[PDB]
Amino acid sequence: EDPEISLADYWKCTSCNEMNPPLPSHCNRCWALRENWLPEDK
Amino acid sequence: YNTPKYRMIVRVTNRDIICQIAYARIEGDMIVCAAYAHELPKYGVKVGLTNYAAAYCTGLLLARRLLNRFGMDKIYEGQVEVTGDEYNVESIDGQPGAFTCYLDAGLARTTTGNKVFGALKGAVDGGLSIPHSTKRFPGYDSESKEFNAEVHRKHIMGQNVADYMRYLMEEDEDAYKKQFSQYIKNSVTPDMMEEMYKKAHAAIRENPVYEKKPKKEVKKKRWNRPKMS
Amino acid sequence: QDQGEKENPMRELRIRKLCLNICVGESGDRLTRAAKVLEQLTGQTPVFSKARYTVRSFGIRRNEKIAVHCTVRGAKAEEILEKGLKVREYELRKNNFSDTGNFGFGIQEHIDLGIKYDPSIGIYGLDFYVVLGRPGFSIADKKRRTGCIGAKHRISKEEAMRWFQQKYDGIILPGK
RNA sequence: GGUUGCGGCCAUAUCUACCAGAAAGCACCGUUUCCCGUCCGAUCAACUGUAGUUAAGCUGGUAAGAGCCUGACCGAGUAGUGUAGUGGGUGACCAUACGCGAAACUCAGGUGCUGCAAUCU
Ligand SMILES: [Zn+2]
Numbered sequence A: 001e002d003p004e005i006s007l008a009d010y011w012k013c014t015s016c017n018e019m020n021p022p023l024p025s026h027c028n029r030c031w032a033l034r035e036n037w038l039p040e041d042k
Numbered sequence B: 001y002n003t004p005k006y007r008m009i010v011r012v013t014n015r016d017i018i019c020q021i022a023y024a025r026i027e028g029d030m031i032v033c034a035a036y037a038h039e040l041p042k043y044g045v046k047v048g049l050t051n052y053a054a055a056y057c058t059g060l061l062l063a064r065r066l067l068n069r070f071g072m073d074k075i076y077e078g079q080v081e082v083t084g085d086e087y088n089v090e091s092i093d094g095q096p097g098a099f100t101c102y103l104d105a106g107l108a109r110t111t112t113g114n115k116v117f118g119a120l121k122g123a124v125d126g127g128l129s130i131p132h133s134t135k136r137f138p139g140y141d142s143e144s145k146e147f148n149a150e151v152h153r154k155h156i157m158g159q160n161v162a163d164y165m166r167y168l169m170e171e172d173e174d175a176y177k178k179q180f181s182q183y184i185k186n187s188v189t190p191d192m193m194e195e196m197y198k199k200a201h202a203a204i205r206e207n208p209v210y211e212k213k214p215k216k217e218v219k220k221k222r223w224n225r226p227k228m229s
Numbered sequence C: 001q002d003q004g005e006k007e008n009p010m011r012e013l014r015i016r017k018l019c020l021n022i023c024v025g026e027s028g029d030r031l032t033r034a035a036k037v038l039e040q041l042t043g044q045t046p047v048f049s050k051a052r053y054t055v056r057s058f059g060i061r062r063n064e065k066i067a068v069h070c071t072v073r074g075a076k077a078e079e080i081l082e083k084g085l086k087v088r089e090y091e092l093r094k095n096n097f098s099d100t101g102n103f104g105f106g107i108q109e110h111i112d113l114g115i116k117y118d119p120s121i122g123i124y125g126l127d128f129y130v131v132l133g134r135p136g137f138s139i140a141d142k143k144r145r146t147g148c149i150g151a152k153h154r155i156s157k158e159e160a161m162r163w164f165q166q167k168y169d170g171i172i173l174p175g176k
Numbered sequence D: 001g002g003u004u005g006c007g008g009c010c011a012u013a014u015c016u017a018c019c020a021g022a023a024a025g026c027a028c029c030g031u032u033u034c035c036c037g038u039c040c041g042a043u044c045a046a047c048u049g050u051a052g053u054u055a056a057g058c059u060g061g062u063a064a065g066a067g068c069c070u071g072a073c074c075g076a077g078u079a080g081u082g083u084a085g086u087g088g089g090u091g092a093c094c095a096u097a098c099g100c101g102a103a104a105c106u107c108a109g110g111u112g113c114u115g116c117a118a119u120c121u
Helices: B037-042 B052-070 B115-126 B150-157 B159-171 B174-179 B193-206 C029-042 C075-087 C137-141 C157-167
Strands: B006-012 B017-025 B028-036 B101-104 C021-023 C047-049 C067-069 C102-107 C126-133
Touching: B006 B115, B017 B052, B017 B115, B028 B037, B028 B052, B037 B052, B052 B115, B052 B150, B052 B193, B115 B150, B150 B159, B150 B193, B159 B174, B159 B193, C029 C067, C029 C075, C075 C102, C075 C126
Parallel strands: B006 B101
Antiparallel strands: B006 B017, B017 B028, C021 C067, C021 C126, C047 C067, C102 C126
């Protein structure tokens, strides 16, 4: 749907196995956060 | 079997504009008349190319060249006055009819105010017969369903570029010097742009014979890579 | 020699649209305040984003008012990316750079960056996912004469890492 | 010898990797006051040909490069198939004789001509 983006930048879920797009940071199937997207706190 | 339904193809490059009028044959299309925007310096304006006024000038030059090639230049002079109203050519009784043609825009977007439609309107002002409406013009209103045609006249006269140059001069110094850099060269003032366009239109109506410069001092040295054995 | 900096006029690493976005758990005045915060941060009018499917894990109905997304281009997107890298303290370690040449992260709170917290306003963060580019990379998206961009002019992941460590002087590749 | 823009006959008419491209022309390319358009001048629409660039696009050549078509004792009259006899086999089937007959593979060739109009040599 986006002509400047590719399927290689799509994010495959580690919890729901769905190849979600770059936005948002929630999973397309499970709405969970992607792995190590925000900075991990100390 | 051989009746020529002529098409006027319009193409817009990033540094020039090409107009052609052709009727296709079995052995390929036959371009009876054509014009390039580089030839606009040979009649009038040596600067300010690829404008909507340049599209109207190219359409008028192509229409006058086609009328000279067809031999119907003396009758059907076209819209001599630069008016924004849509003018449709009526065929002369006792004479040949208007040279009907189709308009080949190609893969260009069919939006109102495009330069291809402006060249079509310039060809219609020159006297070339193609069916078209005033909806895809510069002065048409999409919400009022009407054409004001004074703004279309100013855009045909190139007064929009003159107003843009005036606003860039009164709003900045380096930007007006950078954008209209070669327009500042050779003294193209914000005034007399409509006068220069009218003089160029009158000169295009005066002498429409397209000519080529002879230069036959060409050798056949190979400047390209051929095939290895 | 001459091969060092000559393509840099026509093949420098440039930034395309950044497309800042946040996701709301519901709609209404929270979504209105999120859109107001997005308009205050970006300056452009944001775009509401609907749900693809009703998931109902945390509670979700399809095609509701779910998220807010916008595309930022130019020096404003560069300044927003600089503010995000300063919020991340120039630390994008391992999986931030992609193979195709995308970077990005997520900011936990809009209160720290940008404008300060208010009790009426929320503290919902956002996310950045910036796709880079080269001078002339948009040739495949034109209306006429579509063609490939070429592998040799594409951005590499190691090239993206070098571009990040040059443009931001950033810190990548943590021990974990 | 090159380029542009329309073309015609139409998969021998694809991709990938190097090397080149005099000259012009294309092409990226610079800017959004106005015509137009979106969340975003990214696309589309305007303005200049300046600031730059052959890095991509495009073209040519080179691959014992892969792919695609064409044929071929290329298997090969082969794997086998069906029938017949006065060989049998308890039969099934196997030979005999006849009448049809693949496929993968391999090898050879090619990975298209040309018009119109304009312009650089
Ligand atoms: Zn998931």
